[PDB]
Amino acid sequence: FLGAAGSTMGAASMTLTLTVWGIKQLQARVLAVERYLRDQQLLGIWGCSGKLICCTNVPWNSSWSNRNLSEIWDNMTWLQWDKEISNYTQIIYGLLEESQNQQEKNEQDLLAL
Amino acid sequence: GFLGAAGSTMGAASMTLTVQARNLLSGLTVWGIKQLQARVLAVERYLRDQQLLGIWGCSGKLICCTNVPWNSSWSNRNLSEIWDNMTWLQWDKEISNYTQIIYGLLEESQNQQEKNEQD
Amino acid sequence: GFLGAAGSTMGAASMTLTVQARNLLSGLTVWGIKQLQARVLAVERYLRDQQLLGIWGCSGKLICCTNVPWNSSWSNRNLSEIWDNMTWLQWDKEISNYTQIIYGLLEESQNQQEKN
Amino acid sequence: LWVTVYYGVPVWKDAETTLFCASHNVWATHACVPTDPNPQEIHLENVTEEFNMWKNNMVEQMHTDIISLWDQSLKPCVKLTPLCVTLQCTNVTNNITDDMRGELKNCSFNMTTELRDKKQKVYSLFYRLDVVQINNKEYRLINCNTSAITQACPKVSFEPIPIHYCAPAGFAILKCKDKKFNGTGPCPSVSTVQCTHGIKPVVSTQLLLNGSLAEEEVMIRSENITNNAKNILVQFNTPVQINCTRPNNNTRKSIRIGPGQAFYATGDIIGDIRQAHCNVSKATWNETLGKVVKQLRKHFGNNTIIRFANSSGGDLEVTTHSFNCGGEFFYCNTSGLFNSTWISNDSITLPCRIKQIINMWQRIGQAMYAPPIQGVIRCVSNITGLILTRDGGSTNSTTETFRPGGGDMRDNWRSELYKYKVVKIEPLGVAPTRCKRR
Amino acid sequence: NLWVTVYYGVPVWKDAETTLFCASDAKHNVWATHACVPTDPNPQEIHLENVTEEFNMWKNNMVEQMHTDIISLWDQSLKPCVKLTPLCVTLQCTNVTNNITDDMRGELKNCSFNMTTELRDKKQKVYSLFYRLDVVQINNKEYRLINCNTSAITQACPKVSFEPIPIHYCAPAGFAILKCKDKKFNGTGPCPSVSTVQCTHGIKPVVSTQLLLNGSLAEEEVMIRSENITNNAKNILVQFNTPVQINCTRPNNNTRKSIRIGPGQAFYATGDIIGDIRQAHCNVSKATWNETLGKVVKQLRKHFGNNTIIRFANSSGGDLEVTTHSFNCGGEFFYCNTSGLFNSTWISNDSITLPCRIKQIINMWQRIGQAMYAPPIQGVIRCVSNITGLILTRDGGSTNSTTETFRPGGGDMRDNWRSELYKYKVVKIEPLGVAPTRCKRR
Ligand SMILES: *[C@@H]1O[C@H](CO)[C@@H](O[C@@H]2O[C@H](CO)[C@@H](O[C@@H]3O[C@H](CO)[C@@H](O)[C@H](O[C@H]4O[C@H](CO)[C@@H](O)[C@H](O)[C@@H]4O)[C@@H]3O)[C@H](O)[C@H]2NC(C)=O)[C@H](O)[C@H]1NC(C)=O
Ligand SMILES: *[C@@H]1O[C@H](CO)[C@@H](O[C@@H]2O[C@H](CO)[C@@H](O[C@@H]3O[C@H](CO)[C@@H](O)[C@H](O[C@H]4O[C@H](CO)[C@@H](O)[C@H](O)[C@@H]4O)[C@@H]3O)[C@H](O)[C@H]2NC(C)=O)[C@H](O)[C@H]1NC(C)=O
Ligand SMILES: *[C@@H]1O[C@H](CO)[C@@H](O[C@@H]2O[C@H](CO)[C@@H](O)[C@H](O)[C@H]2NC(C)=O)[C@H](O)[C@H]1NC(C)=O
Ligand SMILES: *[C@@H]1O[C@H](CO)[C@@H](O[C@@H]2O[C@H](CO)[C@@H](O)[C@H](O)[C@H]2NC(C)=O)[C@H](O)[C@H]1NC(C)=O
Ligand SMILES: *[C@@H]1O[C@H](CO)[C@@H](O[C@@H]2O[C@H](CO)[C@@H](O)[C@H](O)[C@H]2NC(C)=O)[C@H](O)[C@H]1NC(C)=O
Ligand SMILES: *[C@@H]1O[C@H](CO)[C@@H](O[C@@H]2O[C@H](CO)[C@@H](O)[C@H](O)[C@H]2NC(C)=O)[C@H](O)[C@H]1NC(C)=O
Ligand SMILES: *[C@@H]1O[C@H](CO)[C@@H](O[C@@H]2O[C@H](CO)[C@@H](O)[C@H](O)[C@H]2NC(C)=O)[C@H](O)[C@H]1NC(C)=O
Ligand SMILES: *[C@@H]1O[C@H](CO)[C@@H](O[C@@H]2O[C@H](CO)[C@@H](O)[C@H](O)[C@H]2NC(C)=O)[C@H](O)[C@H]1NC(C)=O
Ligand SMILES: *[C@@H]1O[C@H](CO)[C@@H](O[C@@H]2O[C@H](CO)[C@@H](O)[C@H](O)[C@H]2NC(C)=O)[C@H](O)[C@H]1NC(C)=O
Ligand SMILES: *[C@@H]1O[C@H](CO)[C@@H](O[C@@H]2O[C@H](CO)[C@@H](O)[C@H](O)[C@H]2NC(C)=O)[C@H](O)[C@H]1NC(C)=O
Ligand SMILES: *[C@@H]1O[C@H](CO)[C@@H](O)[C@H](O)[C@H]1NC(C)=O
Ligand SMILES: *[C@@H]1O[C@H](CO)[C@@H](O)[C@H](O)[C@H]1NC(C)=O
Ligand SMILES: *[C@@H]1O[C@H](CO)[C@@H](O)[C@H](O)[C@H]1NC(C)=O
Ligand SMILES: *[C@@H]1O[C@H](CO)[C@@H](O)[C@H](O)[C@H]1NC(C)=O
Ligand SMILES: *[C@@H]1O[C@H](CO)[C@@H](O)[C@H](O)[C@H]1NC(C)=O
Ligand SMILES: *[C@@H]1O[C@H](CO)[C@@H](O)[C@H](O)[C@H]1NC(C)=O
Ligand SMILES: *[C@@H]1O[C@H](CO)[C@@H](O)[C@H](O)[C@H]1NC(C)=O
Ligand SMILES: *[C@@H]1O[C@H](CO)[C@@H](O)[C@H](O)[C@H]1NC(C)=O
Ligand SMILES: *[C@@H]1O[C@H](CO)[C@@H](O)[C@H](O)[C@H]1NC(C)=O
Ligand SMILES: *[C@@H]1O[C@H](CO)[C@@H](O)[C@H](O)[C@H]1NC(C)=O
Ligand SMILES: *[C@@H]1O[C@H](CO)[C@@H](O)[C@H](O)[C@H]1NC(C)=O
Ligand SMILES: *[C@@H]1O[C@H](CO)[C@@H](O)[C@H](O)[C@H]1NC(C)=O
Ligand SMILES: *[C@@H]1O[C@H](CO)[C@@H](O)[C@H](O)[C@H]1NC(C)=O
Ligand SMILES: *[C@@H]1O[C@H](CO)[C@@H](O)[C@H](O)[C@H]1NC(C)=O
Ligand SMILES: *[C@@H]1O[C@H](CO)[C@@H](O)[C@H](O)[C@H]1NC(C)=O
Ligand SMILES: *[C@@H]1O[C@H](CO)[C@@H](O)[C@H](O)[C@H]1NC(C)=O
Ligand SMILES: *[C@@H]1O[C@H](CO)[C@@H](O)[C@H](O)[C@H]1NC(C)=O
Ligand SMILES: *[C@@H]1O[C@H](CO)[C@@H](O)[C@H](O)[C@H]1NC(C)=O
Ligand SMILES: *[C@@H]1O[C@H](CO)[C@@H](O)[C@H](O)[C@H]1NC(C)=O
Ligand SMILES: *[C@@H]1O[C@H](CO)[C@@H](O)[C@H](O)[C@H]1NC(C)=O
């Protein structure tokens, strides 16, 4: 649990696997359920459900980050990477959703004939 | 944005499913308890819809194709006046009568498919 | 209806999985939190069962087929009278002790079937 | 053979959970969830379930809920803290009968007003069981050294309302449909239900009233029939009608004891005063006791002499048949019922007494004052059961004595929750099959 | 051949009733805006083209929710405060005649009484200034408070403010708020211009009668709205185009005294006024009121006839809350006589002064058994407000009546917030749909 926080990105990619107290317990339970469901739904709408590493169909725009693959997976940590592309997360998230919807429509069209 | 394609045709609004999909889960005092039951209710409604989708074989999909033929007694309009001359809000008012029949048909069909595939 | 095939054999009870799989999710005063905590507990139990199914790679299915062999040390009965002269209530009592270890096996094989 | 996973198997285990309702009054049936108009019930074929009447958690939950509802209904009512004063009391005369000499007392005292400066001088009629004499004479209220009385709000009604207890999602209620079930052991005929039937929380002692009747024969139940420390519950084949009345024409006075607080006192009876009582039939009771004796001899031989004697010892609630007839709390003497011996038209009248300061649920520290009810009161009810106890007659006792008991209200609702149990559904199973994953 | 196809996320909705929560802009206030979740800096409103919805102003669950929430907050904010039970005693009152004017004689009483101390066996003799509306004579003369035979008073906590704060009403997940953007909508029927929002705009819970203050204004025309216009038992809500400024003042220079009536229990009495004594009053402009009344008459002539003459009159009968314009200048409760406003007839610089009175024992929400004592406010007070609407009532003139008479109304605060929630409705999302397609599952 959080054991690869100081390793490179590539190394970490291999290991991704009432009363006062009674009121406080219930809020924690609700928060945990909410977070789990939100993450599962976000993964699902991208077509990445059931996977830990998922390949998408959206090309990488060089304006998000112009570094080479050698100084990303062998020179940074995920905490360092998160600081760079934090401004572009929602753009990529919308692009993934549009791409998956197009795939659904294309599959329907293929089954139509 | 959200519900922006509410007046668009059934074909043009079928490409905006993900917009409405994500705005369904997160999108002691007087104000204290009015906020917790809201969260629990949203979670239960989302889970009920997800289970309904899952027991039809359409789990984790936005558009899903079924083996149930379209009974003409439900509606007789051709496809040229459904996906191009109608809206989902206008389409629901017509077929609101026959929804549960279709739901039962889908459930039985998916269960039969699983039963004969495992055999 | 609900729990209708309780006394019916294991073969005939496999055709009614949805009638019970559907009723596991729906049905500050004295009756204030007795409702809320029960609702949260039901949600948590349903979610836990869903994750347990997902671990073995059976998420989304009612009947799931697995590659783990049935060791001849849990039940020596043959596959004739089990599905024709027995019920789920009687079956659960016999193999209740060997369940937890099987839940291990059912997991591991799955990842191997992905690793291969 | 290979392991195959099924989700949706019909398996269950014994469990324990909190059940909710399905239904001005003490029991807030308007806040409990609405009842389904269609009773849903599934008969279960070729299954037998073991039941235990004497270890049902539904009884404990019902007890706790009834007590909590009682406590909650008493919060917004008037607190009679200025009532604990010295009272000057005199005997009541002027057309009182022989059997009512010394039961009513005319007590005068000083009382607070709506203004903090001045006091009034008022009077009221009290029952002898409510006042303790301290050194005409001077008295005080019986509860002024143990608790603080709260005046029951006069608008609420004490009449019980049927309540249905429902199980949450993932839980089921199983019912034993056997008509000769004795509450413990296997049950062949089983069904599953959503909610229990309409159960009225009727509070009484020594006698079960307004309940349910046995279908074919009188039922006799106990945790250990050969142990004398266990109460014996008897369920009737047919009910016995009982007529209870208090023939006094009362009045109610209102006294302003504070800025917004009123005390409801007793005025003067318009007319003659007489004793409250209850009537039962004689032939019907004789036949019912004969049936109970016939069903009792299956455990104590066919040659033992079976005799019924009255109670012995304890507080007024335990030694008397105590109930509540339309707002007024009755305590009746039942020595004309349990007085007989059985070897190998007219009426029976039970004289009753009335109280107004009530300690419910066997609690010390909380009391309630019941305001007087105007006019005459009358109510008709069904006896549908008994609660007996057996004394330990040793030294070669060929005779058995059964005397009425009670006092603990859990045995009252244990006689209505005895064919019910709560189970948890376990929907995931594994089985050997002749197929394999590809 | 056609087959059923399932779509998840379709834009469909239905009518629903749900629990809406509160949002306020990011401390002691009656409506606990500090416990409300913060509001986003810019709202997300989505205009919905090609869709027409149906609205009804008079069956809206938001009004009932707002009423219940306001009453609950009011009750919750009064629990930890001082119970004035020992104040129900016999008072010895005399008339106040010291630098007073002839229009304010007999309205103030100087009352002396005996009071409890911090020590359970001691008494004190104290005095206070009371209003004539708060004391009843019993048999100088002796008096008592207005409430000693009906209820028990609770002193308002003096650190709690009565000023309204804007409130936003938000919907849970799976719900939306439809907002009508038409200009000539009377609040009933089809609205051909709709948007969707997550929270309503800022609404101030102002409690007043006969006059709506600090509200919202109509954009093009003066709007007359009634549930059943031909029924004379229904109130008429009038919404203005431009506001009318009203200036209200209580000129007395009040002094506050603290009397210790128990261990850690204080009673805030009124001392002596420093200076002269004068009547509280409000001022409106005459020309602006005449313009507004002419516009109201012109817009009311579209419902009753081309030629009918329209006249206004003052209220008639009822308790002082409903026969007068009742409001609150930040701590002090005013009851003003609006008789020079509704006095005119119409056929087809200067100021108007409204004398007001002050009460100190308040029964809110038309309830009985729970009264409240408002502690005096130190110094001169002055609040400036906008009139933005009216609540009217029509007389049932039969027998060939060519004249229609309108009189001010009010008393029920559901109509005060019905005028702010008239363009909003709450809808529930149904994201599951089934449609026919040639596609077949393989
Ligand atoms: C066993 O069940 C029987 C039958 O239900 C029951 O007898 C009933 O008792 C109730 C309550 O005492 C009686 O109802 C009253 O009857 C008369 C006539 O209506 C009135 O005195 C009462 O109305 C006044 O009081 C009400 C109190 O809430 C007020 O709401 C109302 O406005 C009136 O002021 C009240 O209706 C009922 O008549 C009898 N029924 C019969 C057939 O006798 C009996 O009490 C139960 N036994 C036990 C032990 O609980
Ligand atoms: C309609 O809106 C107008 C404009 O907002 C509003 O008038 C405002 O009233 C409030 C409340 O009386 C005024 O605020 C007060 O003004 C002065 C100077 O600041 C002081 O008396 C007050 O401060 C004291 O009181 C506070 C009470 O909470 C204490 O917290 C504070 O520490 C001080 O003791 C207070 O600030 C405000 O100035 C006026 N605004 C104008 C422009 O006149 C009017 O009341 C609204 N109408 C209705 C009917 O609600
Ligand atoms: C209870 O005692 C009171 C007095 O304490 C009796 O009421 C008085 O009766 C006399 C005789 O008729 C009247 O002259 C008085 O006016 C009555 N009132 C008072 C306040 O003294 C009352 O009759 C007695 N009641 C009973 C049942 O004996
Ligand atoms: C209980 O039974 C007694 C005895 O039968 C009843 O008392 C009789 O009442 C009638 C009028 O109803 C009188 O004419 C008789 O004189 C009474 N008999 C006696 C011996 O006093 C009494 O009314 C019955 N009460 C009820 C509630 O049924
Ligand atoms: C219940 O009633 C019986 C009689 O039915 C009472 O027993 C009588 O008590 C009196 C004194 O009150 C004695 O003089 C009699 O001899 C007793 N009679 C019999 C037949 O034994 C009994 O006391 C009553 N119970 C009470 C009052 O608690
Ligand atoms: C209200 O009455 C009080 C007394 O009850 C007045 O206060 C007194 O005023 C006189 C005359 O100036 C002084 O001699 C006393 O010392 C004051 N105090 C007391 C406790 O007697 C007060 O002036 C009156 N107020 C008004 C407005 O008339
Ligand atoms: C509390 O006292 C007030 C004031 O005396 C009462 O109001 C009077 O009620 C009587 C009832 O007969 C009327 O005739 C008077 O006209 C009322 N006076 C005023 C000034 O309104 C009030 O009724 C009392 N309340 C209660 C609950 O007793
Ligand atoms: C009362 O009405 C006046 C006049 O319309 C409003 O004052 C305007 O406020 C806006 C918003 O701040 C300013 O842009 C305008 O310039 C103001 N107008 C004038 C003429 O000064 C005022 O906001 C209204 N509301 C209240 C609560 O006073
Ligand atoms: C309300 O209007 C009245 C009348 O115009 C104002 O009273 C005048 O006040 C001025 C000082 O501001 C005095 O010089 C005048 O003598 C007063 N006139 C009268 C007839 O008494 C009053 O000030 C206004 N009040 C407010 C709050 O605006
Ligand atoms: C409101 O004020 C008006 C005047 O502005 C009052 O009407 C006057 O009442 C007095 C007696 O109070 C009469 O002498 C006058 O003749 C009335 N004037 C007119 C023009 O009719 C009215 O009574 C006040 N409303 C109240 C006090 O409730
Ligand atoms: C991200 O946005 C923030 C806020 O505007 C800005 O300060 C920061 O420089 C941005 N970073 C990049 C890499 O664009
Ligand atoms: C509204 O309808 C018009 C006319 O049919 C169409 O051109 C337009 O795209 C529609 N707009 C939306 C948002 O659906
Ligand atoms: C008065 O009451 C007392 C106390 O119960 C009783 O013993 C006595 O007999 C009565 N005497 C008279 C004369 O009423
Ligand atoms: C009531 O007060 C009076 C007057 O002080 C006194 O004589 C009497 O003893 C008091 N008590 C009573 C009547 O019980
Ligand atoms: C209260 O008084 C009664 C009557 O004298 C007495 O029996 C009882 O013991 C007292 N209770 C307590 C708790 O002192
Ligand atoms: C109830 O019957 C069972 C057998 O079904 C028996 O074991 C038990 O003792 C009986 N209970 C009695 C007689 O109280
Ligand atoms: C009492 O018994 C009678 C006769 O059997 C029956 O009609 C009635 O329903 C029973 N219950 C009550 C509450 O009266
Ligand atoms: C029942 O009571 C008898 C007599 O006391 C005792 O010997 C026996 O063990 C009891 N039975 C059970 C099952 O406890
Ligand atoms: C009780 O007395 C009152 C007053 O005289 C009378 O109206 C009423 O009928 C009486 N009640 C009876 C006789 O049941
Ligand atoms: C009880 O009263 C009813 C009428 O209410 C009467 O028919 C019946 O005979 C009475 N029963 C007895 C035992 O007196
Ligand atoms: C029981 O009856 C006996 C004999 O008549 C009597 O002494 C005793 O007081 C009675 N007890 C009760 C509780 O009725
Ligand atoms: C008990 O029964 C006996 C025998 O008939 C009788 O003498 C006695 O009076 C009865 N006791 C009562 C009715 O209290
Ligand atoms: C206060 O108490 C005194 C002394 O008892 C008394 O004379 C006076 O009337 C009481 N009331 C007042 C001052 O209102
Ligand atoms: C509001 O306008 C509609 C037309 O959109 C009309 O039907 C309705 O009667 C009007 N309401 C009134 C005049 O109160
Ligand atoms: C009120 O009186 C106080 C105390 O003398 C003074 O400071 C203040 O200025 C006065 N307020 C006025 C005259 O408005
Ligand atoms: C109200 O007071 C303001 C200043 O606060 C002034 O400009 C305005 O003219 C006044 N209005 C009236 C109607 O007196
Ligand atoms: C208001 O206008 C009307 C209509 O012109 C006029 O009769 C009346 O005098 C005016 N009121 C004024 C100027 O106060
Ligand atoms: C009333 O007269 C006005 C004058 O502008 C006119 O516009 C309106 O149409 C008339 N109302 C009718 C004809 O109903
Ligand atoms: C209304 O005005 C009339 C006449 O001016 C007056 O007598 C009456 O008291 C007034 N009513 C109110 C409630 O102000
Ligand atoms: C109402 O208006 C009339 C006509 O101008 C006037 O005589 C009367 O005094 C007014 N009433 C008021 C201001 O109360």
Side-chain angles (χ1 to χ4, degrees), chain A residues 63-64 83-88:
Chain A
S63 64
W64 301 335
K83 282 163 186 54
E84 292 212 5
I85 67 147
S86 66
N87 284 338
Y88 320 105

Side-chain angles (χ1 to χ4, degrees), chain D residues 86-88 108-110 120-121:
Chain D
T86 319
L87 328 166
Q88 311 265 338
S108 63
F109 47 96
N110 292 307
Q120 54 191 325
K121 175 185 181 52

Side-chain angles (χ1 to χ4, degrees), chain A residues 34-55:
Chain A
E34 283 186 82
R35 294 255 254 145
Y36 168 81
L37 285 191
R38 288 175 185 175
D39 270 352
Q40 288 318 320
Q41 171 198 52
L42 210 53
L43 267 194
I45 48 178
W46 302 337
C48 292
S49 59
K51 330 206 64 203
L52 294 174
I53 309 173
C54 168
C55 310

Side-chain angles (χ1 to χ4, degrees), chain A residues 57-106:
Chain A
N57 220 8
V58 174
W60 186 265
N61 185 4
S62 325
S63 64
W64 301 335
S65 180
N66 47 7
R67 333 169 92 81
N68 293 322
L69 290 181
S70 177
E71 39 212 87
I72 293 178
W73 298 100
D74 220 44
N75 215 28
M76 305 183 93
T77 65
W78 279 103
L79 280 168
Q80 293 188 232
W81 177 251
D82 174 73
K83 282 163 186 54
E84 292 212 5
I85 67 147
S86 66
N87 284 338
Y88 320 105
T89 294
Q90 296 298 326
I91 304 171
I92 307 169
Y93 282 12
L95 279 157
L96 293 156
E97 289 164 30
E98 312 167 5
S99 173
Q100 166 76 352
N101 212 317
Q102 266 293 8
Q103 298 183 27
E104 304 277 341
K105 176 56 177 170
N106 285 350

